[PDB]
Design a protein around this nucleic acid. Structure first.
Lengths: 131, 136
RNA sequence: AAGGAACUCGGCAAAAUGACCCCGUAACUUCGGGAGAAGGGGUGCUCUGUUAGGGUGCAAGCCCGAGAGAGCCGCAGUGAAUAGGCCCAGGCGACUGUUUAGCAAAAACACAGGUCUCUGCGAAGCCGUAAGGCGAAGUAUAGGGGCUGACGCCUGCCCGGUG
RNA sequence: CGCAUUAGCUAGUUGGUGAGGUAACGGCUCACCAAGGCGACGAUGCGUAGCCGACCUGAGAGGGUGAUCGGCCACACUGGGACUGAGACACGGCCCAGACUCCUACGGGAGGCAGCAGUAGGGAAUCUUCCGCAAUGGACGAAAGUCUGACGGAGCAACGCCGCGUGAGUGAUGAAGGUUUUCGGAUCGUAAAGCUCUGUUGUUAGGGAAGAACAAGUGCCGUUCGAAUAGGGCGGUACCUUGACGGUACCUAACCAGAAAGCCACGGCUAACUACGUGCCAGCAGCCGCGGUAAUACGUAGGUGGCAAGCGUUGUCCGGAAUUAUUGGGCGUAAAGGGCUCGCAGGCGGUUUCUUAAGUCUGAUGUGAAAGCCCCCGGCUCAACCGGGGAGGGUCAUUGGAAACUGGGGAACUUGAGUGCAGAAGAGGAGAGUGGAAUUCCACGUGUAGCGGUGAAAUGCGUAGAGAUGUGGAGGAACACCAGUGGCGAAGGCGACUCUCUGGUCUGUAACUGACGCUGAGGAGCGAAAGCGUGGGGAGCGAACAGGAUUAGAUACCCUGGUAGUCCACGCCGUAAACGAUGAGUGCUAAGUGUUAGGGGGUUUCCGCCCCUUAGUGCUGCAGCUAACGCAUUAAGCACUCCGCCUGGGGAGUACGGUCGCAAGACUGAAACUCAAAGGAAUUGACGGGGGCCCGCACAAGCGGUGGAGCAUGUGGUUUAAUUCGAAGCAACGCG
RNA sequence: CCGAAGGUGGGACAGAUGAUUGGGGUGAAGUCGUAACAAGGUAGCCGUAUCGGAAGGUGCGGCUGG
């Protein structure tokens, strides 16, 4: 079943925000590794680590509550659901909360972020809003 | 619902019914059929001019003329102003206006029309009720 | 001739259809029917052909003869004969049957069905005084008697009187 | 593009060979064969409709429109045909048939305004029977020219848009007069008049453009032809010509504020208020709703407000409306989870890697005409408008790059799924057999006068011996205690016991497979109870029905009887408040706590305690959700997939149609009409023939009365000339 | 030969209209009851059968929305 694992990792991060958990184990496909690597390098996460194993692998996420009680990640969303896929041209790439959030957009040269795909001027799947 | 369910059944849009349907048709004489003309006003000949009453708490006697039209339909229209010319077999031009008080009546007799004379002794609301600018 | 049911108790009688092949066919329906519904078309002869196609024969030759084209005659081609008239609605009876030989063929009987009641088998009922039988070499899914009549939906109230 | 309440539609239809025919390919037409073709991705049928560039609305997505202008189409009184011609099956051509109008000497003829004007009719409703070919096209001509209702103009209509107007500066006697007033005034208000002044427009009178370039005719020059400087073609000049609009736009001078403002509203939404008349009447209204003698809501006046040669009403679009929700809604209780399953099609698809390039992105090329929207400039006195220049708009075609994702193809993996092994539990199902209470009935003994039943009784049963009691027998149906928010099943549902056959689950894995999975319209099945058919069965109960009570009535509740049914076999129905009023799957997201079936551990061989983990089942609870109640790891949280369903209440789950059914009915399912609510959850009260507590001459316990009689007194009716008026259950009536 | 129209015929769809009829809605303080809302005076409702002037009653099963 499970029907798409990208939306499920985004809700797993969102529920870990609302509970204010500090760690997440996610069963770690390769696009999940690139999503959590992007969210690491954009400062939404403290750090992300990989556990390469036999079953399917584990990716562990360390959610960042930088100050007093401040969810750096406020909300996540999945745009292209498996049943309405979303594809944006390069002159239609969405900039979110106008600049203050971001959109994980997997174009033809790598799973890119918003600004990266805008400056590389290619478009593809539009697969997460991250606020 | 889901997108596949929206693809194979769609969103069915809500039905529109006109508030005044007897204007919303017409008639040609030799084709013997009942065309959709969507017209603002219709002249017809009075079949019965009486007066009758509303239903509940509001209680004051209304005006009530019944008119058969040029498309063929008899509707009870209303004669708005104070004191009216009309008889039976009177030529009447009808606009669409709902009279909430008297039930079953959903048109006005245009005052100032073909035979419905402008009302008597009126200076405020001149164009409604038909009367000319009198003199000064 | 013309008219055509104006006859009449009533289309009684008479007329009309009436064969073979093809097309097409309603309401209703118990799904079977209705139905040969209805309403139409073609039917001769001649040459293409002892044919296309079959039956028999080892072959010859004999039968059977769809379909087409061409054409020919007639007012008329199942040229005579004799071989449905049809449709719409209603009452009753479901129906096929039976019936007053010799006035009444029915809406009457009968019917499949339903129901009630009797009867333990030497049944009950029946014939006969009785023997003797029928029932029946049958045994309550059986056998008599009353009633109602396919099928569909149902069959209300009264046990006071008479049984 | 609307309907499935249109599901089956084709037969020259679907192919073949051959021929004909056509400008051409072709069942386009014909012969001969084959049984094809379209189909829930919606055939066919019915209804509607010219399509588009564009136009209106909207933040946009969209929704509606298809006027003008421009492209393609189809039509020419209706149907058919051909002719000629390059091109027609021809608007102002032909032949035929039909209807209509006309002429006729009765034999026969003519006609087609859906060309520009106009007429009649239909209608709420849309124009001149005008001037010109001057300009731009067309046709013909060698040309001049001719024809041109195309086109240029002109006329009518506020029909729309746009622009300028009806004056301006100064002005307090706040004049007269209106309206209002606590009569002090406030207001119409610097608004009139006073003074000063303009002339756009009004009018009179002069002057007068661009739109004109030309064509043709001359003369040159260059040049090609030529037998040649004839002569003609081609190009450049260099002249002479040409206006319907029209003495029109336009410019200039003269004169006078003189000619020029109305419509709607004023309770809220919604800017704008008073007065007089009316008195639930007249009337207003889009809604809330006004008006029943103090109406800012009706009618009028004053005033104010909005706009402005317009204004208001109507009719339709779109918005508002997140009110069809893709953007952008929902389903526990407001409308809404199919009763539940098995599953076809469809949709969706765990992981690693190679490859492909259909989707996706990107580049180049073509193209999406002109006008239009948009940008930038220009010209009309500005504006509308015109003009120039550009942009925009395609899931568009060809072509070239990318390879993350979706998909395709191959190889790998084990978590999801499933098989294997091992146990465990269960009212899981179906068939047969058996039991023990009790109930009824039957026979006999005991024995005597009641039993039964009720709020009270009565009907019933009973001296022909009942009820009670003892024994025996018949027969049917349900299975006390166990028994439990316990178990199993998809749901319905399943409780004695035993066997026969049989379904599923849970737990422990590691042996295997390696994505085999989820969901599922339509289909197929199960599906409580009642009901139906056939055959049995009948103990209790019990519709219907009867008697007795109650009662104003009592077709009821109560009582006494009692039919079908309840039961069984098979077949049909196919419905429930079929409920968790909560679709299925999966993952994530604090705890505490019982319990059901398992597993493992820390001492003990145990009993047993603790810890740990599953799957199911309860309660309380954090975050989160919600309108609230509440849900909360068994979600109503946070998500993804798929299905079903909702779009105010009624009419109405109705009617019609269809399918299914023996029937009863089921399923599908509107519309006219009608309302401004229907509804959920919660709050305050009031009430209850609901619970609790309490109190008072309220009840009881007493004592005396009133109601009866006589009179006094007050009140209703009635008599009246008047029997004055007021009070009218408690709370009027020896009351004022 | 094809062939428009016309003719005959049997069906299909659609609109009127039709004695009569059946349910529906709305209406001047009409008649009969009081079924529901409270334990609504027999808890109510759902499905189904049956009966009854009528709301309704009764049976069976289910539900709490006691």
């Amino acid at each position: 079943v499970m029907t798409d694992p990208i939306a499920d990792m985004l809700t797993r991060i969102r529920n870990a925000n609302m509970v204010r958990h500090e760690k997440l184990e996610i069963p770690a496909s390769k696009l999940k590794r690139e999503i959590a690597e992007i969210l690491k390098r954009e400062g939404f996460i403290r750090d992300v680590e990989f556990v390469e194993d036999s079953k399917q692998g584990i990716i562990r996420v360390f959610l960042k509550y930088g100050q007093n009680n401040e969810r750096v990640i406020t909300g996540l969303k999945r745009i292209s659901k498996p049943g309405l896929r979303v594809y944006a041209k390069s002159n239609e790439v969405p900039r979110v909360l106008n600049g203050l959030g971001i959109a994980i957009i997997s174009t033809s040269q790598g799973v890119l972020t918003d600004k990266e795909a805008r400056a590389k001027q290619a478009g593809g799947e539009v697969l997460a809003y991250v606020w | 619902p889901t997108i596949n369910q929206l693809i194979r059944k769609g969103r069915v849009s809500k039905v529109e019914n006109s508030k005044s349907p007897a204007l919303n048709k017409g008639y040609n004489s030799f084709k013997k059929e009942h065309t959709n003309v969507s017209s603002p006003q219709k002249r017809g000949v009075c079949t019965r001019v009486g007066t009758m009453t509303p239903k509940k708490p509001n209680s004051a006697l209304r005006k009530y003329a019944r008119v058969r039209l040029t498309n063929g339909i008899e509707v009870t229209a209303y004669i708005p102003g104070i004191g009216h010319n009309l008889q039976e077999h009177s030529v009447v031009l009808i606009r669409g206006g709902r009279v909430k008080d008297l039930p079953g009546v959903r048109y006005h007799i245009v005052r100032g029309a073909l035979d419905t004379a402008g009302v008597e002794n009126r200076a405020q609301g001149r164009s409604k009720y038909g009367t000319k600018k009198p003199k000064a």
